[PDB]
Each structure stands twice: as structure tokens, then as C-alpha cells.
Symmetry: D2
């Protein structure tokens, strides 16, 4: 009578699914392809929606400890402050990726989720069979494809899809705060520092805690200096001289990567006993900082629909119908914002922009009205 | 088998108790002495702790709609900004008293709490008897004394106590925002505007929403002009000229009162089947903006302890033991702050100051670390 | 024994020459080609050097009354303040062109300078003969060619020269201050408001007094909207929205012109009894705001050299040798600044930039050290 | 035929008189009581009027080199900026006392003024006799009493007078700028930093040049800590913490003095061939920073009246009649400002306040209109 779930992928989506299912009495095993449990991307923003998932997962405490809510989300254009936004009290948080990942892994382990590394799902069958690269075939009542933009759970089954990999991208790093060295200013703020002149270069400045600063350095791929790794210190200091202390530390990082944006959209997220969650289903532009938020809401919501006494197949259909439109709208709006460079104007966290963030997955209503 | 509760007082404490008990299946009747259900005091701050009570009461949505979280809590001394505090993301909110009261009344009514007006508790018996001014004697399994600083539930039984009524006080009003007329500034902020020179006059500036502004005008009773009602417009405009548009509206209010501060502390909060909650038990100085927050946490916590399968008498003892120290510490610290004028320095919402605010009554842990 | 001077041109150079010579006992007649005595160009800056000429001319009082020294000379790039300069106390002043012109005309009249309008010099002879368009031939001991960039005194004689008329230019206007309507800011400042993005548009904001504001609206000739007269209100408000009240008034002016920059440089400024002064000799780019300053210093200096007991011919040679290098350097540096857009960086009023301004023609030394 | 002048006192008044007379062909001897030529008081402000005297004395160049005009004269009350004043371009300057004194001494020496030290005037006779402490009796056509508030030239003759020495005063010091250590701010400004709460303490912050800062630390004599010398570092840092780097240097100065304010007013300034100039005649409160300015204007004006071909006795009478009302008005207004603490309000350099500053002694008119 113990339902069995097999989860492919140990990112935020897979860990969320695994914890949520285990809390509801599922026998859960999670399979991570990589040799270690790790999260790439340097830093990450969560909002009310994702923080509520964490509360629902019993992992909120560990996350809030050692992460940061800036006093304001500030936008600059050509070094002129154009907006300061606080979202009418809507909760939000910045943290390192490792911080969020560790909290989730620790919670999954505390609950007794069986986690395997070097364990890649290479095929999934809608009847409830997952095949690993080792040739092991696992039977389950539920298969969760949380295996990222390149999901083999998805592609082994075949889902009609549009995927896009941009030519442009950015360099994401964690460096020391160097707060004193930054001198006068509001250095606890998020500051999105846009420029189009004299060149297209932007830094998203994102404090994670008293020690760690998350920087995103964005320049076009066609710019050989701005897109260089390790960073071309001179061209960054030239346009962001007020960040020189931090940029000097950034230039030391030989692990720096220029990572490209990538999106996925599918005609459906389910097939029989298989559900696709996270980037496997709905990778999106990061303008609204909701890729993981939506992934986590969707994973948590999946566990909710599986508590209705329905067949797994029916629960999965109900789940997508219920929760997908929030994600579709957020993905579309984030892509629109990215293409139009809407964030450069400031004051763009409108009620519509904040729809996903306002959703409370625990009570299934929208909170924090704007 | 339906447990019966009789609640004396229709303030925030009594309404919270009534809703929380009704949600847990108690047959609840609430008795308000006044001819109408009303809340005095103009405006009010709630923090995470109180907002979590509201969530637990199913009244959070109605409260957040039409209330305000300032971008920052700012302090001025002699018109110089000395601090801006955002509490590392700790949720907080400002609203009119009527806004909070209405949300609670509407929720109690929706749940079918029996509410009587012109119904004053004049005596309570620890065996579970409440006598109204009408001579009606009501039997119950639980009596809640939520009847304010002058609690007759408390005083009919006899509780060792120290009460204090200050000679000093303040004038609290709601006026239009007049935001455009205030011109350049950060007029969505809370701004605590202190002065000792040329006279002791202070205004706590507290936006409630896009339409309503809560002002507290504080001057010593020995100052015949600053303590006058309706307000002596000239002496307020002289020291707060930047608020003239709002003060002109304030001066129109012939309902204005100079209300005195009042505190209560008791050796215990329980006797048999009687529990004292709110100002009946623990009225405190308003420096930490936690009088109602603690009252609401205590009322909600009472309902929790009554779900343990214990006798009512034992549950009440357990309740006070569990929850009272948070209130004792907050009351003491708020009184210390008031006497030392500590808030005038700015940056005084320390981790210790925020202890009560950080408490989450739903999960019974402290959240939002500083 | 009364030396006779004939001056061609009633601009700042010619009026300065006429007053200075008349003060020294010359019989002076001045000939203005136009039907009225008028000054075009809306507004003008003078510095210490030009203010000292005015003192020497007995016209300083009338100029300082009704003109303005801003508290600072401020530069913006893309709406971000990049510098505020006060030149270590070096005197400077902004005024309407008419204000300066009127003061000079009134002083010349008070001294009994004979002024003719509709009186154009069409030929000059180094032996001391000036021919007017009327055919009148005037004999004099000194002929002053103060007849502008298109000087016929110069060109009738033949001076080796390089002249340049730019394709680009600007629209100069006087509008009401609208100070209250501009709201919060430092609206008594000079503010040089540069932009390259989203288009090349710049406004030099120059208060003249409590009533009048001098604006220079600069856009490339290749921009059909930004270079349009009367002004294309929308494209100016878009990039300078904080000046909308003033720009609305500017758009009413059907007299607005897009005037082109023009320079002149000559191998010499003298021939026999003929001296060329002002734009006739040394028109320059306006970056250092010294075209008229140098013109006035040169005209005044001419009068000084004529007091040495030398022949007029020798005095003129001595004059150019003594005073020309200040002008040559200023012209070259202003042209360099214009071409490199150096002023866009702010903090460019260096000691070298301010050399002409620092010169005191009365004492013949440099003052106001930097 | 060479007129002989004997000047008592080598302060700013006596040096000005000596230079001005020597320039006009007087045989001038100056007698300084002290063993060295020195100026006490740390720093000093001059305005247009005094700068024009310096121009008239041929000492302006040496003064402007190595002195400072702040970008603005700023006033703070309780650390809040209440005004920024630039006087519509009216020239002004801050310098060390030694800087001004040296320039004057060097000019007097260059002109061949005979200067004696350890040479005290102890008696003067209206017939033109000056007696030194050595017993030497000097005959002259003019005797100038420029010997300070305690003038023996004045008191040996007997002038009806009111003198006042205040109980209160201030500590004036020169310290290093420590500009970098002061961090963010407008540290080239004059800043008059007033406080009445928590104690009456004020600092006038006055940069003299890139190296030297003039500070005036003002507290009541009844305050044993604030009036202490060497300075009580703690009580100054407490109320001016932003000046700590400079105050630490100030506390090292064991030469610091708490000097009292002193005023003098006389029924007349002349007797026969004797003229009283400077503090000997008109010491005043320093609120308008015009004590030396008026002293210098008066000394220079004296030389002017002596060029009219009148008897010395008549010239002196004409001089006082012509020039004294400017000083009487300035003295009265400065005393009014001091007593009413008017400067604490900011924006008090009104046209009337600036009357003395606006006077141009060279042309004998008022300039720099407000
Ligand atoms: C630049 C940038 C900035 C962003 N910023 C934010 C932000 O601020 N806030 C936010 O909420 N989101 C943000 N996002 C989006 C966020 O990174 C993703 O949406 C999120 O990490 C998706 O998580 P996931 O678990 O679906 O996928 P992934 O994080 O890709 O994790 C899947 C895990 O899949 C494992 N794996 C892959 N294939 C297999 C397999 N076949 N079998 C087993 N394991 C497999 C992968 O190795 C890995 O361990 C940002 C994205 C980008 C690109
Ligand atoms: C100036 C000031 C500012 C404050 N600001 C804040 C703030 O910002 N945030 C915050 O959390 N707290 C604040 N407080 C404290 C807050 O006002 C109180 O702690 C709170 O209202 C107490 O609620 P209560 O229900 O216990 O009592 P009450 O609000 O006094 O309500 C009891 C209700 O008792 C009814 N009643 C009385 N006697 C009887 C009886 N015998 N029988 C039946 N009914 C009876 C009373 O009429 C009334 O309807 C502030 C207090 C003051 C004085
Ligand atoms: C955009 C711009 C901004 C500027 N801003 C400043 C500034 O802020 N400060 C500054 O000092 N300078 C400034 N200048 C330069 C300043 O305008 C000139 O250098 C100055 O006006 C030259 O004066 P002028 O007397 O030599 O010539 P003009 O002003 O040209 O005057 C000559 C006079 O010549 C009369 N005339 C012409 N031909 C004859 C003839 N044949 N016979 C008789 N009369 C004749 C002309 O009609 C006229 O009345 C600026 C210039 C430009 C273009
Ligand atoms: C706190 C303070 C701040 C001030 N700030 C300013 C300011 O910013 N700007 C400004 O313009 N003014 C200022 N003043 C006023 C200024 O200090 C005086 O007005 C000025 O120094 C007066 O100069 P004096 O030459 O008349 O007298 P003094 O400076 O007193 O000089 C007279 C000289 O007299 C010599 N002496 C005295 N007796 C004899 C004698 N019997 N025989 C020979 N020699 C004699 C004295 O030793 C000395 O060398 C300030 C004054 C004070 C108190
Ligand atoms: O626009 C972005 O690339 C972006 C990336 N991360 C967070 C965010 O709010 C925006
Ligand atoms: O100090 C107060 O009186 C006070 C009153 N209300 C809220 C608060 O934070 C402080
Ligand atoms: O750069 C200019 O065009 C310019 C024009 N007028 C004054 C000035 O300082 C600069
Ligand atoms: O008020 C003063 O003591 C004062 C002292 N020096 C200059 C000044 O402007 C004011």
C-alpha cells in the first residue's frame, strides 16, 4: 500500500518533489546524474511563492538563516537611480544556490529520501518504469522528470516542444561583499545596473548575506571583452567603477562561465504515470526571477494533487490543468520583458509581473495584493 | 460534548480568541459591553507574529487588502534622518484600527460566533460562570477575560496586579494622505519624527493605504498647546512644517482625544476555567508596537493548548507557562524603551526588540532571523 | 590733436572698442549695418576676464544688476550628476544677450559715442579710410573691424584665413524660469544636460535672473526632429521630462532658429591703421564660453596699446603680439573640447581651460588661481 | 613736502593704513608693540569689500594664492542642512590669519614702510605727537591709532566709549583638512554646525586651502567641558562625530585658547591729526565676518580722504562722516545676529546683512546686488 515514486534529477524541482512526496508517505527515491549533489548558477532569488513552498517542505528555517532580504530592489540606468521597489511587503529573499540546495538536501535526508548520485535516468515509460544508465529498470507508481532542460525522461517518451538556446548570456559569480570598500551608498540593496552607452553592459548586484555577494555580469556574446571569462577586469571597472573592489575579486575566479539563456515549452507535462517538472517542462527567461519559484510551486502542487484519492494518471492531468497557467503566463511575460529590456525602465514589477510571486501554494490563493 | 466558551470583550484579543475557538469546534459566544462593535485608536501596526495569527484565523486576506507595508521604517531626530530599518524581510503592516477590527468581526460572523453588544461581563467565577450586567448567569467550560485594561472578569475574581496610568499621552488621528501636497520625499515610509528642541514634540507618521494616513502627535501633558484637542495647528505646523497639508486636515477633527498610556502586569493570567488575555493581563507601552500582537498571539495560543486533551484548568496553566515569557520580555523592553526614549536614536529594532515579532505562533518557533 | 576712430560693427566687440577709446579721449564713431541695435543668441556667459572689461568700461554695475551667478556649474550625463564646479571663486555671470548689449549701448551713449545704424562698412584702407555702403568715405587715425565673422573690413583688405561653418548647431531661446513648476531640484544652477542614448540630445540650462531662463537645445542637423524649429516638443520632453514646464513655453516661440557653429582664424589681425577684433578675427567654438570674453578683452586691450605714445601702426602690432596668444590658445582648446565632447565628462574646467577667464585685462596679470 | 605718518599697531588695520599711505607718497613708519609681527585667531573670512581693499593695496594676488572660496556657505541645525548660500556671486574667501598677515607685511616691506617691533605707542597728542614706551617722541602730520581694542592712542587722548567683554567665547584652531578621512560629504564647504540639544555646542567649519582647516569651537563659558583647553575631545566628538579625524588633531594643540568676544563703540574716531581705525574704534561681534573687512575699508578710505588737498584735520572729519555709517550699521546688525542667534536659522545673509560686503571702496559704490 506504500506508493512508490522515482524522481529523476536532484535540482530544486526534484528535491522539492521528493520532500513533498515523502512527507505524504510516499516511498521516494531520487536519482542525480552528477557524481555529487551540487547547484550551479552562483546565486538565486526566491519570492513569497517559493518561500511558501519551503515552509510547506519544512525547509524554510534553514533557508532564511544565512540569506538576505534587501531593503529595496533598485534599478539604475546609466548610473542614475530610476526606481526603488518593495512590492508592498511581498516577501522575497536572495541566497547562494548552494545555500538553497543544501537546505533542500538536508531536509530530504532528514526525511529518509533515498538519494543516489551517478544515477542517470535515460528512459521512462508512461506505465511506470524508469531505466537508469546502469541498465537498472525501476518500477514505480509515479515517475517525476525533474531532469532539467535536457530531460531524458521527457525526450525518451517524446513531447512536442519548442526549445531555444540564446547566443547571449551572462557571467554569474559569488564574491565577498567588500561592503566597507564600497564606501558611501545603499550596498544592501538589490541594484540592477543597466547601460546601453557607451556599450551594452549590465550588472545585477545581489547581496546574499553579510559575507557573500552574487553578481551577474551581462554583455552580448558579440562583445569579445565583456563576454570573456575569466572576466576582463578593465571593461567592467570602466562602466562600474563603484564596484571595483568586488570586481577585482571577481577577476580572480578561473571557474567563471559565460552561460547562455535557454527556454522550453511543451504541449503537455504528463504521460500516464510520468510528470515533468521544472526546466524539463518550462525553462524560461530569468527577468521575473521565477524559474525555480515556478518549478518549486509545480513540484509541490504535484504532491497535493496526488492526495485526492484519484488514480495517479488522473491526478497528473488534474495537476497540470490546475497549476500550468500560472507558469505559462509567467514564462511568456518574462520572455517579453527580456526581449523588450523592460526591466531597464524600472518600476516594472507590476501586479501582473508579480502574479507568480503572489501565489500561495499552501492555501491555493493569491496573497500580498499590490 | 460540545465545549462552551464565553468571551468577554470584542477587541482584538476577544475576537481572536472567539475565532480560534470556533475553528476548533467550540460553541462560542462573545459579549461586548459597548452598544456597537468598534475599535478606537485610529491606526495600528502588526508584525509577522500578528500576521501569522491572522493567517491562522483565516482573516489574513481581508487584512492585507487595503493595508500598507512601508518601504522602510525611518526615524528622524530634529528633521535629520538617523535610521532606515527593514528588519531583514520580517513581515509587517500598517492599517486603520477599523480595518483590522472589521476583518476580525467579519470572520467571526462567517464562522457563526454568537456576538452580543450591550453585553457587559461584570463577574466571573473560576468554576465556569459568567454574570452579565443584565443579571444573566452563563455557564461555560471556558471563560475568556478579554475585557481590556479595566477587566471586570479579572477584578471580580481578584488578581494581584500593578497598574499604571501615565500623565502623558498622545493624539491619534486618521487623515487623508495628501501625498501630492507633501511634495518631494519618501512619503510611503513610516517616519518617526522626534524632537526635544525647541520643545518636546514628536509625530509618528504611518501610512495605512493609498487613502489614509495614521498620525500620532505626542507632546507632554504639561504642554498646554501641544496636548490640546482639537489640535493646536500652529504649534504642530511650526515643528513639522513639511506635514502642513495633513495637519490642516487633522485640525478639523473635533473627535480628537489626548489619550494616556496605561500598563497592567499580573502575577498570573488564569484561575480555574478563566483565562485573561490582552490588555486585561498585559497592557504595555507601545514603543515596540506589540500590544495587540502579543494579545493576538496569546489568544490564539490559548486555543492551541485547549486541543491537548487536558482539563481546561490544566490547559490554561500550561498555556501561561508556555507563552507568557515572550510577553513579559516584550512588555519590559517596551517600557524600558519608552522611559529611555530609546527609539529617538534610531536603529533600535534589534534582534531582542524584535523577539515578539519574530515568533511564529503557527509553528511555535522563531522565524525571520536578524 | 583729437585722434579719430571709426568702428565697424555694433556687437560686443565694437561697443567695447568704442567705449574704451572714447574714455581715452578719442573721437569715436560706430557704424552698425543693421537697422536697429540688437544682439542675437538669447543668452550669454561672462567670466572674470569679461567682467573686468566691463569694470574698465564703467558698465559693470548695469550688467550685474539683473543678471545671475549660479551657485554651481553642474554637468549631467544621462540624467546623472557627474560634476559640480565653482572655479575656486573665479567670478562668472549669466545674462540675456539684450541685457549685456543694452548696458554697453547705454554706456556708449552716455559717453557721447556717435552711433549710426543702417551704416555698413564695405571697404577699409590700411591708410585710414573707411567706405560705407552709402558711398561715404571716412578718414580716421584708426579703423576697427568689429564686423563679425563675415567682416568686410577684413575681406576688403584681404587676410589669409581659415573659416569653417559647421553642419551642426543648436536652438537658443529665452523662456520664463517656471521655477516653482520645476519642483524639487537645484534650479538656480547652470546644468549642462548631456545625452548620447537613446539619441544625441543635450540642453544647456542657464538661468539669467529670477525671471528669464536661457536654454540651448543641441541636436545634430541629421536629426530632423531634434533640429526642428519651432521646437519638436515631444522629442525634447521625452529626454528632458523634468524641464517640461519650460519646454512647453519654448515650443511657443516661432522665432526659434537652428544656428550653426562658425570659426575664423587669421594669420594676422592688423594692417596699417586697421585692427580686426572679435569674431572678425577669432570666432571660436563655444565650449569654454569665451568668444565674447576674448573679443571684449581684445577690444579693451587695443585701447590700452594706443596709449603708449607710439604710432597707431606700431601700437596695433604691439597689441596683437601681446594679447593674441591668450585667444589662440582658448580657441584651440575650445575647438578640441567641442570635437572630443570633453564637457560631457564634467570637471573639465581645468586651470588650462580657465586661462582666458583668469586673465585680468585691467592689471594685465592672471588672477583667481585654481 | 613729504607728509609723515606714524601708525600704531601692526594688525590688519595698521598694515592696511601703512600700505595705502605709502602708495600715496607718505613717509610711513609703523610701530608694533609685540616682539614679532604675528596674527592671532587661526583663520579669517574676507568678502568683496576686503578683497577690493587688497586689490587697492597691491596685495590681492598673494592672498588669493593659497586661500579658498568654498562652493557654498552651508548651515546645519542639529546635523540637518538648513541652508546653502552663495550670495549671487559676491566674492568671498577664507584663509589663515598668518596668510593674510604675511601678504600685508610683505607688501608693506616691498613699498619701504618702516616697521618697528617692540615699539608700543603709549600716548598720542592731537597736534601730531606720538610717544613710545621707550620715551621717544615722534612728530607727524598724521597719527593712526590702529592699536586694537585696548588702544592707548585712543585712551591717552580720551574718547567717550562703550566697551564690552563677553563671558562667552570660542576656541579657534588650524588643523589638517583630513579630507579623505572625512569620507562622503561636501567638505570644501563652509559649514556652520549649530546645536542647542543635547547641549549648546557649535562648530564653524572653514576650509582655508587644500592643506589647512580653520575650526571655531563654540560653547558657553559655563560649560566646563566644552570651553576647556586643550579641547575635551570626547564632548566634541559626541556632537560632531563626522569631524572626529579633524578633532583628534585639534586635541593635540596645547596652544588652544578660549577667547572672549569684545566690542567697542566710540562717539568719534578722530581728534586733530589722530585717526582711530579698526578694533580701536569699532570692534564688533563676528556674526557677519566683517570686523577686519570694515577695519581694512576704513583704513583704506582714510588714505583716500587725505588726497583731497584739505588739512589733515579736515580730511579726518570728512573721512569719518563718509565711511562710518557702513560700520555702525554692520556692527549693530552683527550684534543683533549674535544675540538672537540669527545665523542658526540659515538664509540670513540678506541684502542688509551683506551691505558692508557689497561696498566697493575703490569705486565708492555698492556692487554685487542681491
Ligand atoms: C541566469 C539565470 C538566472 C536565474 N535566476 C533565477 C532566480 O533568481 N530565481 C529563480 O527562481 N530561478 C532563476 N533561474 C531559473 C532556475 O535556475 C531554474 O529554473 C532551476 O534551477 C530549474 O531547476 P530544475 O530542478 O528544474 O533543473 P536543474 O537545476 O537543471 O536540475 C536538474 C538536476 O538535473 C540533473 N540531471 C539532468 N539529467 C538527468 C538525468 N537524465 N537523470 C538524473 N539527473 C539528471 C541535473 O544534473 C541536475 O542535478 C535562473 C536561470 C538562469 C539561467
Ligand atoms: C497609543 C497606543 C498605540 C498602540 N499601538 C499599537 C500598535 O501599533 N500595534 C499593536 O499591536 N498594539 C498597539 N497598541 C496596543 C493595543 O491598542 C492593545 O494592546 C489592544 O487594542 C488590546 O486589545 P484587547 O482586545 O486586549 O483590549 P481592548 O482593545 O481594550 O478591547 C476590549 C474590548 O473590551 C470591551 N469591554 C470592556 N469591558 C468589558 C466588559 N466588562 N464586558 C464586555 N466587554 C468589555 C471594550 O469595550 C472593548 O470593546 C497601542 C496602544 C496604545 C495605547
Ligand atoms: C552658440 C553660441 C554660444 C555662445 N556663447 C557664448 C558665451 O556664453 N559667452 C561668450 O563670451 N561668447 C559666446 N559665444 C560667442 C559670442 O557670441 C561671439 O564671440 C560674440 O558675439 C562676437 O561679438 P562681435 O562683436 O565680434 O561680433 P557680432 O556679435 O557678430 O557683431 C558684429 C555686429 O556686426 C554688425 N555688422 C556686420 N557686418 C557689418 C558691416 N560690414 N558694417 C557694419 N556693421 C556690420 C553685425 O550686424 C552686428 O551688429 C557664443 C557663440 C555661439 C555661436
Ligand atoms: C572670534 C573672532 C572671529 C573673527 N572673524 C573675522 C572674520 O572672519 N573676518 C573678519 O574680517 N574679521 C573677523 N574678526 C574680527 C577681526 O579679528 C578684527 O576686527 C581685526 O583683527 C581687527 O584688526 P586691527 O588691526 O584693528 O586690530 P588687532 O588685530 O588687534 O591688531 C592691533 C595690533 O595691535 C598691536 N598693538 C596693540 N597695542 C599697541 C600699542 N599700544 N602700540 C603698538 N602696537 C599695539 C597689537 O599687538 C597687534 O599687533 C573676528 C574676530 C573675532 C573675535
Ligand atoms: O533580467 C535578468 O536577466 C534577470 C536575471 N535575474 C533576476 C532578474 O530579476 C532579472
Ligand atoms: O514610541 C511610541 O510611542 C510608539 C507608538 N507606536 C508605535 C511605535 O513603534 C512606537
Ligand atoms: O559646449 C557648448 O556648446 C557650450 C556652449 N555654451 C557654453 C558652454 O560652456 C559650452
Ligand atoms: O557667529 C559667529 O560667531 C561667527 C564667527 N565667524 C564668522 C561668522 O560668519 C559667524
Amino acid at each position: 500500500k506504500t506508493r512508490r515514486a522515482e524522481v529523476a534529477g536532484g535540482g530544486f524541482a526534484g528535491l522539492t518533489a521528493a520532500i513533498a512526496l515523502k512527507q505524504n508517505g510516499w516511498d521516494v527515491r531520487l536519482h542525480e546524474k552528477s557524481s555529487e549533489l551540487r547547484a550551479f548558477g552562483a546565486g538565486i532569488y526566491l519570492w513569497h511563492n517559493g518561500l511558501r513552498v519551503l515552509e510547506g517542505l519544512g525547509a524554510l528555517d534553514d533557508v532564511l538563516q544565512g540569506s538576505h532580504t534587501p531593503p529595496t530592489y533598485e534599478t539604475w540606468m546609466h548610473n542614475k537611480s530610476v526606481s526603488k521597489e518593495t512590492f508592498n511587503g511581498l516577501p522575497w529573499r536572495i541566497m547562494t544556490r548552494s545555500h538553497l540546495h543544501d537546505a533542500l538536501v538536508n531536509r530530504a535526508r532528514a526525511l529518509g529520501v533515498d538519494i543516489s548520485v551517478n544515477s542517470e535516468a535515460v528512459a521512462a515509460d508512461p506505465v511506470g518504469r524508469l531505466t537508469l544508465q546502469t541498465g537498472e529498470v525501476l518500477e514505480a507508481d509515479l515517475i517525476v522528470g525533474a531532469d532539467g532542460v535536457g530531460s531524458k525522461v521527457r525526450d525518451s517518451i517524446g513531447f512536442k516542444q519548442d526549445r531555444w538556446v540564446s547566443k547571449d548570456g551572462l557571467i554569474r559569480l559569488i564574491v565577498p561583499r567588500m561592503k566597507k570598500e564600497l564606501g558611501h551608498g545603499e550596498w544592501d540593496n538589490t541594484i540592477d545596473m543597466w547601460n546601453f552607452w557607451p556599450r551594452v553592459q549590465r550588472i545585477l548586484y545581489s547581496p546574499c548575506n553579510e559575507n557573500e555577494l552574487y553578481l551577474g555580469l551581462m554583455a552580448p556574446a558579440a562583445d569579445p571583452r565583456g563576454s570573456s571569462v575569466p572576466i576582463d577586469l578593465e571593461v567592467w571597472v570602466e562602466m562600474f567603477p563603484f564596484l571595483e573592489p568586488c570586481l577585482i575579486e571577481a577577476a580572480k575566479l578561473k571557474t567563471a562561465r559565460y552561460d547562455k539563456y535557454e527556454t522550453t515549452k511543451l504541449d503537455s507535462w504528463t504521460r500516464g504515470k510520468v510528470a515533468l517538472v521544472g526546466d524539463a517542462a518550462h525553462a524560461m527567461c530569468p527577468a521575473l526571477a521565477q524559474g525555480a519559484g515556478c518549478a518549486m510551486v509545480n513540484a509541490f502542487s504535484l504532491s497535493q494533487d496526488l492526495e485526492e484519492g484519484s488514480s495517479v494518471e488522473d491526478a497528473l492531468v488534474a495537476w497540470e490543468t490546475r497549476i500550468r497557467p500560472i507558469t505559462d503566463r509567467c514564462q511568456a511575460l518574462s520572455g517579453d520583458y527580456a526581449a523588450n529590456r523592460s526591466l531597464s525602465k524600472g518600476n516594472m514589477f507590476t501586479p501582473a509581473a508579480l502574479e507568480a510571486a503572489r501565489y500561495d501554494p499552501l492555501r491555493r490563493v493569491y496573497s500580498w495584493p499590490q
